[PDB]
Structure formats: C-alpha cells, structure tokens
Amino acid sequence: VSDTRFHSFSFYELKNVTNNFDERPISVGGNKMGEGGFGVVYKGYVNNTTVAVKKLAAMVDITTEELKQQFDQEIKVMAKCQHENLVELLGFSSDGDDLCLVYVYMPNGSLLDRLSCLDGTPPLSWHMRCKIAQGAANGINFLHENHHIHRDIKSANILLDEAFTAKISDFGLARASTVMTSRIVGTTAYMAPEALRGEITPKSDIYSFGVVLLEIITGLPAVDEHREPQLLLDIKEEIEDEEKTIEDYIDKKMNDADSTSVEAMYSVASQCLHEKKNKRPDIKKVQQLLQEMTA
Ligand SMILES: Cc1cnc2c(NC(=O)c3cn4cc([C@]56CO[C@](C)(C5)C6)nc4nc3OC(C)C)cnn2c1
Known about the structure:
The protein is of the alpha+beta class. The chain has two domains: 6-105, Phosphorylase Kinase, domain 1, CATH 3.30.200; 106-294, Transferase(Phosphotransferase) domain 1 (Transferase(Phosphotransferase), domain 1), CATH 1.10.510. The chain has helices at residues 11-17, 64-80, 111-115, 126-145, 193-196, 202-218, 233-240, 246-249, 259-272, 283-293; strands spanning 7-8, 32-36, 39-46, 49-56, 89-93, 100-104, 148-149, 158-160, 166-168, 175-176, 179-180, 199-200. Strand 2 (32-36) and strand 3 form a beta hairpin. Helix 9 (259-272) runs antiparallel to helix 10 (283-293). It is globular. The protein binds the ligand Cc1cnc2c(NC(=O)c3cn4cc([C@]56CO[C@](C)(C5)C6)nc4nc3OC(C)C)cnn2c1. The site of ligand WFQ has 20 residues, from strand 2 and strand 4. The ligand Cc1cnc2c(NC(=O)c3cn4cc([C@]56CO[C@](C)(C5)C6)nc4nc3OC(C)C)cnn2c1 binds at residues 26, 33-34, 41, 52, 54, 87, 103, 105-110, 113, 119, 121, 159, 169-170. Residues 27-290 form the Protein kinase domain. The active site is at residue 152. It is found in: Cytoplasm.
C-alpha cells in the first residue's frame, strides 16, 4: 500500500491565493518573493496559513521531462526526510497548467537575502549567524546520515524561519548515496572541483557548505561580477598567501563578532574547502567543530 502522502491542492486554489501568481514584489502589493532556475516562489494564504508556493518552469533552458523528474524527486525526498533544519513540504499541484510545490512560509526568507539585507532587513548578528551555521550543518548531517546528497548547497537554499532557524531547501537534484554523471548541475560559485567534473559524492556538499560559511563570515556573495576577486572562494587563497587576513574580510555590518569564534568558523570553512575531496572533514566533524565554536 502507498501509506502516507502529501495533500494535493487545486491549481486554481493556488492560483487564487497567490492573486493569480502576481509576479510583483510584496512591497508593491504583488506576491513574488524570489525565483530560481526552476521556478518562481509566490506568497500565498491557504487554510488561515501563510504559505510559499513555488511554480515550476524552465528558467535555465531545461527540458520539461527533466523538470517533472525533479518535481518528483523533491516530493520523494521530502516524504522520507523530516528534520528540524529541513524545510517541510505542505503539498503540491499537478492537475493544472504548471507544477506547484507548497511549503510552510519562512518569515525571514533565505540566508542569501538576509546576508545582503535585501529589502532593508537589519544585518544578522554574529550570534544569529553562529546558530544558522550550526543549524544548517545539522540539516546536512541528517541528509548525509540518511544517504542523501543535496548537490546544490548554497545560501539561497538555506531558508530562515520565525526564529531564524536554518532550513535547507530545494531537493530537486538530490541523489541517493563515487559515481560520475553526464549532466553537470549546481551553482558554479559553490561547486567543488570534482562536482564540476561530474563526480557525485557527499564530499561535494561539504565544500559548498564551506563557501556558505565564508558568506556568513564576510557578508559577501559567493560571486559578484563587479568585485575583485569575483569568486569568494578565491579569498581563501589571498588569506593563506598572506596578502590578507580573515579580519580584513569580516562583515563590518555586525557589532557582536569576536575574533576567536570567527577564526574558529573560518577554520571549519578552510577545512571544508580543501580542494582534495578526501582531505575534507565529513559533516559529523563539521558539526562538532561548529558546536565547539560556541562552547
Ligand atoms: C524550495 C523552497 C523555496 N522557497 C521556499 C520558501 N520561501 C519563503 O517562504 C520565503 C519567505 N519570505 C519572506 C520574505 C521577506 C521579505 O521581507 C521580509 C521581512 C519578509 C523577509 N522573503 C521571503 N522569501 C521567501 O522565499 C524566497 C527566498 C524564494 C519557503 N519554503 N521554500 C521552499
């Protein structure tokens, strides 16, 4: 028998509670909160509950069959994986014109957006950042403990709930768990070199998480075409080659950071970013180092 499943929404009900998928920003009165390579995310309100509705689409010139596959994968993964640091799927729509996925609304959006204080939100404190780093590592640990590879760890896919708890999202490319694939996927600025060459391994998640930790420490996005260096991961080299120090790069929009715990987190990041996959820590070691950082 099929057992537990997710609620099915009417496409028309989702259309209805997102104001017909209004792509205007929330401040303008619309419903668009964000977008990615595979969909646009709309704020909705169903059953006296604020929700996030992701309406899938080919925004990076993917095929329709591949998108349907990713839709199916995320439902499969979300059915098996429930944890305090993973987002929760409320339901889906597949009857109407487009595929939709419905999630618990995350009042503080994505880590990427909060690090960029997008829309005027106040900067995250060091204390909040440490909790976020710890929570995301607990979420990755749950995934890896349950033999899942995320393949797209990045600060846009770490969402922040009503308590600024980190919630990992977007499991459409997740893989069961070393093998080599012909379809290279992910976000270039976060990807381990072996992932960039087609290898599939949880060690690649660890590298990408190290980039996220650099974003947390510095407030800088992983890539910025108008910045020198354009890739954040290249600051590790400038620090190691003593052109710079980690203090030179610490986010200045923070009044409560202290050198010891920042250097402790940078140490974890540096260990995750070892470009030899076999030299990186596993997630359980990352978790432990991060717990000791605020001990
Ligand atoms: C796979 C997947 C994708 N996305 C999601 C989401 N998203 C959201 O709930 C979400 C919520 N907010 C709230 C705000 C703000 C704007 O001004 C403020 C004061 C309110 C912050 N901005 C958001 N942005 C959101 O999403 C975007 C990052 C795409 C939930 N689950 N989920 C699962």
